[PDB]
């Protein structure tokens, strides 16, 4: 339609969460979150919706609500929830980025790859040459947890960090879908995320409402029971 079926919640003066819902037989209405970030006179987008239509809606909300050009998007992992609307971005002329491993996994997940691949220093930090002018966006790769390619981003100046599918809600009873999980490293990855963004007080979840640092702690402890 025109942004009418996605939820957009203000999370900081310059940050908003986009939530869209899957409509697929055999599935419930499943929420997926990404972020929208105003960085001065430009917007940056973390993730897409399930479909191009939902993703197009996000662009419209930006256009109506913010009215600043959309400079880039990053996708945090390869699956329908975050990568589904890739082509909506390219159709719009938006430069997209993903972990190299993600772009390579996109086809086997039935998704279109981002235009550009991110490579990471052994630090776990993205190579500034592969992610030019990301501004406040700070991109960390903790290693394999929930999936092999899961990346996470921090938002400078807000004390918000986005954990992807990595961090589950502090009320989570399980780690969920351990199909692409890495049994051995999942606890260390979770904790490395926490050290990576030591100041962030709000942890945006992939599916649920934003949480505190306790979710990080909860996750790691659940993953200790994997080994």
Author numbering: 44 to 270
Question: What does the report in the manuscript say about this coordinate set?
Answer:
NDM-1 has been reported to be a highly potent carbapenem-hydrolyzing, zinc-dependent MBL. NDM-1 is an extended spectrum zinc dependent β-lactamase capable of hydrolyzing nearly all classes of β-lactams, impairing the ability to treat life-threatening infections with intravenously and orally available carbapenems.. NDM-1 resembles the common β-lactamase fold, although it shows low sequence similarity to β-lactamases deposited in PDB (20–33% sequence identity). Our results show that NDM-1 is unique among other MBLs due to its enlarged and flexible active site, and explain the observed extended spectrum β-lactamase activity.
No zinc is found in the structure and only an acetate ion can be modeled in the active site interacting with His250. The three apoNDM-1 structures include two pairs of monomers A and B and one monomer A, and the structure of monometalated NDM-1 (mZnNDM-1 Δ36NY) includes four monomers (A, B, C, D), respectively in the asymmetric unit, providing nine crystallographically independent views of the molecule for NDM-1 Δ38, NDM-1 Δ36NY (monoclinic), NDM-1 Δ36NY (orthorhombic), mZn-NDM-1 Δ36NY (tetragonal). In our three apo and one monozinc structures, there are nine independent representations of NDM-1 molecules with different crystallization conditions and packing environments. In these structures, most active site loops show very small conformational changes with the exception of ASL1 and to some extent ASL4. These are key loops contributing to the expansion of active site accessibility. In apoNDM-1 structure conformations of some of these residues are very similar to zinc-bound states (His120, Asp124, and His250), while others show somewhat different side chain orientations (His122, His189, and Cys208). Cys208 exists in two orientations in apo-state, one is similar to the zinc bound state and the other is rotated about 45 and 90 degrees in chain A and B, respectively.
